[PDB]
Structure 1
Amino acid sequence: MRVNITLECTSCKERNYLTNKNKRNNPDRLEKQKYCPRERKVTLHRET
């Protein structure tokens, strides 16, 4: 089951990115180091 997901910056809680993932292949919340435009630096974003 592949679903659209939102990656939110952990630092400022800003829903910066939209992506998608297969729940079965990745049961746990995804986490990626992405650039947060609000904070203007690379931060850890975790699916919401």
Structure 2
Amino acid sequence: MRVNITLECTSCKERNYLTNKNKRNNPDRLEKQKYCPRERKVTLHRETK
């Protein structure tokens, strides 16, 4: 149903953020233009595999 999920900076590769999804509505891996703390720059974040 709904699983805890962690995001991933696609450049410096740190598990930055955490959120929740409903994986029968959304079976894919999300893509949001979140913020990166280590780089101070907007970075497209994706689901950790």
Do both share a fold (TM > 0.5)? yes
- TM class by shorter-chain length? over 0.9
Give the 3-state SS of the residue equivalent to 2:45 in structure 1: strand
The alignment's TM-score, normalised by the length of structure 1, stands at 0.93
* Structure 1, unaligned runs of 5 or more: none
Aligned residue for 1:19? 19
| TM superposition shift of 1:6 | 0.3
| TM superposition shift of 1:10 | 0.4
* Structure 2, unaligned runs of 5 or more: none
Identity of aligned residues (%): 100
CA distance in 2, matches of 1:47, 1:19: 10
RMSD of equivalent CA atoms: 0.6
Q: How many residues align?
A: 48
Q: Output one character per residue of 1:14-41: Cα deviation in whole Å (capped at 9) or x when no partner.
A: 1110101000011001111101000111
The alignment's TM-score, normalised by the length of structure 2, stands at 0.91
